[PDB]
Write an enzyme that holds these catalytic residues in place. Sequence first.
Site, short mmCIF file in Angstrom:
data_model
loop_
_atom_site.label_atom_id
_atom_site.label_comp_id
_atom_site.label_asym_id
_atom_site.label_seq_id
_atom_site.Cartn_x
_atom_site.Cartn_y
_atom_site.Cartn_z
N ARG A 31 0.81 -1.21 0.00
CA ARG A 31 0.00 0.00 0.00
C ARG A 31 0.85 1.26 0.00
O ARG A 31 0.39 2.31 -0.47
CB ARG A 31 -0.93 0.01 1.21
CG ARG A 31 -1.73 -1.27 1.40
CD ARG A 31 -2.70 -1.51 0.27
NE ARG A 31 -3.48 -2.72 0.46
CZ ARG A 31 -3.13 -3.93 0.04
NH1 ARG A 31 -1.99 -4.13 -0.60
NH2 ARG A 31 -3.94 -4.96 0.25
N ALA A 66 -5.89 0.52 10.56
CA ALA A 66 -4.82 1.42 10.97
C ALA A 66 -5.35 2.51 11.90
O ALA A 66 -4.79 2.75 12.98
CB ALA A 66 -4.16 2.03 9.74
N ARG A 100 1.35 -0.55 8.45
CA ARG A 100 0.82 0.64 9.09
C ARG A 100 -0.05 0.35 10.31
O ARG A 100 -0.53 1.30 10.93
CB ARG A 100 0.00 1.46 8.08
CG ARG A 100 -1.22 0.74 7.57
CD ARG A 100 -1.87 1.48 6.43
NE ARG A 100 -3.11 0.84 6.02
CZ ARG A 100 -3.17 -0.31 5.35
NH1 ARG A 100 -2.08 -0.97 5.01
NH2 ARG A 100 -4.36 -0.81 5.04
N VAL A 135 -20.66 -4.63 11.42
CA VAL A 135 -21.72 -3.69 11.78
C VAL A 135 -22.58 -3.45 10.55
O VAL A 135 -22.09 -2.95 9.52
CB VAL A 135 -21.14 -2.38 12.33
CG1 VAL A 135 -22.22 -1.34 12.48
CG2 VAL A 135 -20.47 -2.63 13.66
N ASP A 189 -13.54 1.68 6.15
CA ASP A 189 -12.91 1.94 4.86
C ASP A 189 -13.91 1.90 3.71
O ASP A 189 -13.50 1.76 2.55
CB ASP A 189 -11.79 0.93 4.60
CG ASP A 189 -12.27 -0.51 4.63
OD1 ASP A 189 -13.44 -0.73 5.01
OD2 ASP A 189 -11.49 -1.41 4.28
N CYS A 209 -20.50 -0.41 -23.70
CA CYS A 209 -20.06 -0.48 -25.09
C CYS A 209 -18.56 -0.23 -25.22
O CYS A 209 -17.89 -0.86 -26.04
CB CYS A 209 -20.85 0.51 -25.95
SG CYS A 209 -21.34 2.04 -25.13
N1 LIG Z 1 -18.89 -3.03 8.19
C1 LIG Z 1 -17.77 -3.19 8.89
N2 LIG Z 1 -17.86 -3.56 10.19
C2 LIG Z 1 -16.75 -3.72 10.90
N3 LIG Z 1 -15.48 -3.56 10.51
C3 LIG Z 1 -15.41 -3.20 9.22
C4 LIG Z 1 -16.48 -2.99 8.36
N4 LIG Z 1 -16.03 -2.62 7.11
C5 LIG Z 1 -14.72 -2.61 7.23
N5 LIG Z 1 -14.28 -2.94 8.49
C6 LIG Z 1 -12.90 -3.03 8.95
O1 LIG Z 1 -12.37 -1.73 8.94
C7 LIG Z 1 -10.94 -1.80 8.76
C8 LIG Z 1 -10.60 -0.92 7.59
O2 LIG Z 1 -9.22 -0.52 7.72
P1 LIG Z 1 -8.17 -0.79 6.57
O3 LIG Z 1 -8.81 -0.41 5.23
O4 LIG Z 1 -6.90 -0.11 6.87
O5 LIG Z 1 -8.00 -2.37 6.58
P2 LIG Z 1 -8.05 -3.55 5.51
O6 LIG Z 1 -9.27 -3.31 4.62
O7 LIG Z 1 -7.95 -4.88 6.14
O8 LIG Z 1 -6.77 -3.24 4.63
P3 LIG Z 1 -6.37 -2.96 3.11
O9 LIG Z 1 -7.42 -1.96 2.63
O10 LIG Z 1 -5.02 -2.27 3.19
O11 LIG Z 1 -6.35 -4.23 2.33
C9 LIG Z 1 -10.65 -3.27 8.43
O12 LIG Z 1 -10.42 -3.92 9.67
C10 LIG Z 1 -12.02 -3.78 7.97
O13 LIG Z 1 -12.09 -5.13 8.40
MG LIG Z 2 -9.52 -1.66 3.47
#
Ligand SMILES: Nc1ncnc2c1ncn2[C@@H]1O[C@H](COP(=O)(O)OP(=O)(O)OP(=O)(O)O)[C@@H](O)[C@H]1O
Ligand SMILES: [Mg+2]
Lengths: 76, 985, 147
Positions: B9, B424, B461, B500, B524, B580
Amino acid sequence: MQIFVKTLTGKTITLEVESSDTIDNVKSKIQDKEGIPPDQQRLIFAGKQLEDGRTLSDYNIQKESTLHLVLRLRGG
Amino acid sequence: TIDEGLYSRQLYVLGHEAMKQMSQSNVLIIGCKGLGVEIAKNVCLAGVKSVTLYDPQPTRIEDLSSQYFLTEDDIGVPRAKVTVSKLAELNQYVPVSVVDELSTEYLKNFKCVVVTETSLTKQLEINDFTHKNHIAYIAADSRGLFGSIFCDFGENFICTDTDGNEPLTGMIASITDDGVVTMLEETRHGLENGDFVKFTEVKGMPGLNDGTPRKVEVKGPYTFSIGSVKDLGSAGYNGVFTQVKVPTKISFKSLRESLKDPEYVYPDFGKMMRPPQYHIAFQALSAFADAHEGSLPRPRNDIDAAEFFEFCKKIASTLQFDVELDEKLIKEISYQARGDLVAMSAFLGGAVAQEVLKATTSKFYPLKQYFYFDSLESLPSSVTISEETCKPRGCRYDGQIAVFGSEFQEKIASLSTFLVGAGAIGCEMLKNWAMMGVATGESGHISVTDMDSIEKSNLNRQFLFRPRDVGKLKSECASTAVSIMNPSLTGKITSYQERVGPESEGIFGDEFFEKLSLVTNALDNVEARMYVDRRCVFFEKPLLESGTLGTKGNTQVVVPHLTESYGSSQDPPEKSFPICTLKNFPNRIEHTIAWARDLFEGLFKQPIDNVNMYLSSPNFLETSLKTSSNPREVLENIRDYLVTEKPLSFEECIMWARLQFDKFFNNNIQQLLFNFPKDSVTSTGQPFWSGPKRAPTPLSFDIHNREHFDFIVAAASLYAFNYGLKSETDPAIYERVLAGYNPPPFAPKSGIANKDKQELKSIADSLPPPSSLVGFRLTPAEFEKDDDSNHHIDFITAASNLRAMNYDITPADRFKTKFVAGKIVPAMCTSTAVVSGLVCLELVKLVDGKKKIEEYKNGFFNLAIGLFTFSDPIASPKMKVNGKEIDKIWDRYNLPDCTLQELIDYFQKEEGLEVTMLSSGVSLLYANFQPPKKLAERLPLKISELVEQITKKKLEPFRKHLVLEICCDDANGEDVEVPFICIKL
Amino acid sequence: ALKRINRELADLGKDPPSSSSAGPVGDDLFHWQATIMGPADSPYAGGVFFLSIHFPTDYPFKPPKVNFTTRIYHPNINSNGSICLDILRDQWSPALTISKVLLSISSLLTDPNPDDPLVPEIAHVYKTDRSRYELSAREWTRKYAIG
Ligand SMILES: Nc1ncnc2c1ncn2[C@@H]1O[C@H](COP(=O)(O)OP(=O)(O)OP(=O)(O)O)[C@@H](O)[C@H]1O
Ligand SMILES: [Mg+2]
Ligand SMILES: [Mg+2]
């Protein structure tokens, strides 16, 4: 009156406006120069986010003022 | 030789050359307190060659206020000695060392020198040496709710990349004889004045294709100018332009010269008179410490404040500073001198670590040169802050009590927070809460949820996790790590592995939410953000949102009955290409990558799913025939993957891969060129293959070509995986099998009743009966980017590059293909630290229960250009309902579980409004235009019964409320907007 | 979302589209079924075409997914029912109503665009041999869009 808009990515935009113009006109000008719909624009001047329906003189925006065009980010 | 399995990343933010330069740079860090340890952690995670620490001062208890690698068993030991062991674990490629003695001549071994917790005389001594020897110098300071950064990279700093953006490229339509370049229809170049561009594929003006950059004069959003091209040609048609980014020369001043005439970076334009004040204030702090054996002013002490103000007056007079000193602000700086906040430390550490990376890579624009910041709006006003309350108690929270007091510490210890996500930002937030002492009181608690598991790329990170933790749940590991950091959190953190969303409302129900104090999002994706926002709005809880992308980040705060929610604003949506364009007329590598992903899905996923469903569901054929859009495709897939094209060895897989190569890279192109020959024209006489449409050319299979062989290998391996066969990698067998291949003849087809149903039935009965095959299944391929041995990215890259070769598009490598196909979000540790610091600075505002909307700040920043900006939140809109002021977001109607008729009568009588529509969830409970019979059937039912009947689903036992949306009209017939209804079951 | 969808539904109810009729399936507000009548001055005259509309959870901030259910012999419509319409992929804005989309689809039906086609074979037939295209379109609309 001439104002400047700085984007979160570093780009600078020069707008020719008037003190009596509403924020809607400024957003339309920014859309014309950038293609960003007015509903997705976040403009900040002196720590205040500009809202639709008000005029520039309400925010005391004068000539050579600097606004910031920002956006929210989805990562984290 | 960068380990792309760890820096995946980060490479999408910096690049390979930048990290190559980083891996050869040494960083010295003087000071190992919270700010120093934060900087060292970020630098170790970044991947510099090595880190050296210098801090021989013995540990004190108050140092634990923001130092999370110090424990109460380390008191009396030098800080660097006890910190090096824990810093050496963050990254295995970055050694960490300690020096017990520092000399000036020793500084020549380091690419960057960072200075914290050092007096101004020592800083001048160090900078006088580093400046004349061309060594990057950074000095950072954190005093209570105030912070300062100073950068000096030398007089001849070369910055190759200034803004950190990708070069701009675009397709041209026509270039006149005067250099007026025009873009294609409704296309913006996005250039600015003074940029440089280079042209290629320009027809009629070969001279422009050499590659010499030319100045750009922007004449509008769609056209620009490059000068006079009279000699090169008369007019040019079509072609592409690409921006050229040129290095810049930045000249810095030494600290000694910069003290007299500083150059400021303003983090907020709302307060532009303050940085000149802080410049004097910090120098006065240094003078005071020098005059008191290195002791700072005592917390909230008036004698020390007066002496400090005298020092400030003396310094302002000496430096000829023509600024009137603000006594209140300066004395506030004096009062909080001994403060040590983990949020300020994290914010400044992220900023300073990014500056260190800029120094070591010559990338992005550095700070030039002074950066003074304050978060004085976070000072509590609901509690007593005085000399008696702010005196130290001999505890690990002394650095925070020195700013907020003991009463606010008691308020913090009683929080009941809910953290959604453990990535992170989640790890940083948990660290900040542990250091701040959140939820360590008798009535405090922390709940953290995350359904994901730890992966190798996450260790870059997410510093709470280690390589031994790969494969475990994030929430449990984070809770254990923070319990290690602050032992008072033992037994006060609950970790869930639940996502969630609508399916988890049985765990995060009314009882769970009613006990919370605030919710912090660390997600995210936008869907989860919107869901959590709606839940917080319903339960009226404060929400802290934050987001990052590369070097950019933002933080927002949602306060009940004061501001608008997170979902009241719009963000730009994701861009999807026309079908298309993807299917027939690609012109970018992104189009070919999307096509290759669709090809992967349609070759290795959908037919396998159809075959598996056929062998499981007894009545699949009829349901597919009467439901699927194209049942003939389903029948053909089942037949081909069961009987016709079933492989018995890997040789048959290789032959199948060769056949697919012919099918998708030679035959469809021939058909397309048969439909639209290269010389064909549109209805207006223009040539068809002009502009965004590029004429393709069929590919002939050559075994010795690299891309062809890569596609064959990947396709054969994936087919074998589908059928569970052993796959080889030796090119000898491939070349031996493919040598004896006779391509079936192909000729494009020119085209030219209900009996086809008989053919469909014949195909259906040709399939083997499901009972004949019991226990037989085909393994589908689930796309997985992060694994480099499943051939997914290999296949997608090979197919994308082959289709690019079809349309003469420039191919990409596995790095860019993985970035595009995987929807990877660039990520950094520095941005995460900054956003966590800002969020934790807003958290104390939330705890204090501030009511005015001018006290809260939403923050935005871009570290690549050193831009910070803050703005007040937007107040929630108001409305007039029945001559009453109603909050449009935070107000609701509370009704019993009455009947529909009773609800309508209540709205008619009480509010004076006529109900016209009533809906719950995704169903229409009542509408004014429904036929009278249906209404008479539905009117006398209770709301719960009506919802159950219409949705054909009983309400869960844990369900304790219903949310209804109502549209009603007034007496005159004008529609009036009203808040939602909360039916109590 | 719900407010906007019901506003559009009520607006349709007040003024009948005459040439179209869209409404929720069963009671689900996010899944509609629409009907389009073939233009009189077109090969598809005397035909009824059923469309499925899927409103996303983010409506009106994301385009609705509009697909044809009946089979139509059109250069810009493929066998899966996908429609080559700009306003449904990237030009979508939260200011376009469903009636506007239906009018756009009807205008697409009344005159195809073979210069930027989705089905190259039908576009080739339309550009080279118009009469055969007319015959094929009439046959398809008679054996699929009637009854
Ligand atoms: N609906 C949700 N409920 C709970 N946790 C969630 C939900 N959607 C995303 N997460 C969590 O939020 C965090 C997002 O942080 P981050 O994007 O840095 O992590 P990641 O998706 O595991 O990593 P990467 O994007 O680098 O592959 C992750 O732990 C993801 O599991
Ligand atoms: Mg992510
Ligand atoms: Mg993950």
